[PDB]
Symmetry: D2
Subunit: 115 residues, 4 copies
């Protein structure tokens, strides 16, 4: 599990469950091609998106559908979604944990990278 996404709800103080996440990889033609997708679990985590064999060097985009999440709770959010764009494995394989802390009009995203 070289890529893990964790989403938390800062309004309710709980994991953000059933949040849709789409991952893309920048293609040679500067186009974003679908790479993997899924929904966060009851723990607010999404595991098994890819394997170290498939997760090669490149630029990736993790899109978190925050809008749908807030609408389901009856809250009109500001952002359409949260995006995290980064270069991965440029100096060798690494393990990435992408966390997003969500509020209707604000979100923070942090990355923890290990070997």
């Amino acid at each position: 599990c070289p890529l893990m996404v964790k989403v938390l709800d800062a309004v309710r103080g709980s994991p953000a469950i059933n949040v849709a996440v789409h991952v893309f990889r920048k293609a040679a033609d500067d186009t974003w091609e679908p790479f993997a997708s899924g929904k966060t679990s009851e723990s607010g985590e999404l595991h098994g998106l890819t394997t170290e064999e498939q997760f090669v060097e490149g630029i990736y985009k993790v899109e978190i559908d925050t809008k749908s999440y807030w609408k389901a709770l009856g809250i009109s959010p500001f952002h359409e979604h949260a995006e995290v764009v980064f270069t991965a494995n440029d100096s060798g394989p690494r393990r990435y944990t992408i966390a997003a802390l969500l509020s209707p009009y604000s979100y923070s995203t942090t990355a923890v990278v290990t070997n």
Copy 2:
């Protein structure tokens, strides 16, 4: 205005208005003595808390009554209040802006020193 406090509401995307703020300075006996207080304005800001003459080197505590703010909106918050404790260095012309971004179960505080 060497010290300014700004409070924002991350739930509504607006300044946090009428938020009580208390500032304390640590006394020689390690006790927190009242220094200044006020409530944020319609812009979520609190100016005029002190003067450069009064704002001497020391350890200060800025307490933001976040609990009362959320209760007024009908939301049960997690924290009793938000606290920012820092040392005023006083090494060259310096203005301190303390900002707090509030959510019911989370808050971030940032300091911009210029």
Copy 3:
């Protein structure tokens, strides 16, 4: 000034100066078309990006070149850039302030609509 962008540096506790910002509007063909751009000032702010006449309802993308900012300071950042995508509602007098608090491996973005 219906749209304003503010960028702060959480590592140095100061405004993030000379940060390139590009704004895009989603076109009818779902394509991102250039809308406005500029660089933050000494106060970390970027004003005058557009006018209320030009700023019509739609989906906008604000791209902040955070990578170049950190590289100039000798720090290898995680993100390529920071993106804020939102819908301008245009339902009553509304000013949008988009703020981004930057750290090498983390950033937060908040919107204050007044």
Copy 4:
């Protein structure tokens, strides 16, 4: 483990290791009495601070010595420490995860509360 503290470093993108944490409980005389303390592990987490039997209703203060952490890295931080004050178990026993994301001049703290 009704109380867990997690500390992350937003500058290096890693867990904040060996961070001193002191927990206090407000006494009947409005005084902060020592409750528990420890240091974060290699994962940036601190477990085993207390038990559900000892963790009774009350107001608690979790103090994170962020200043020492940054000084060890050669960075002059703004805050003396990070404090999190909250009422716990007022409506029954709950599990609390207190997370702190650290930067030299900024920090965010979030709480995830479960049953």
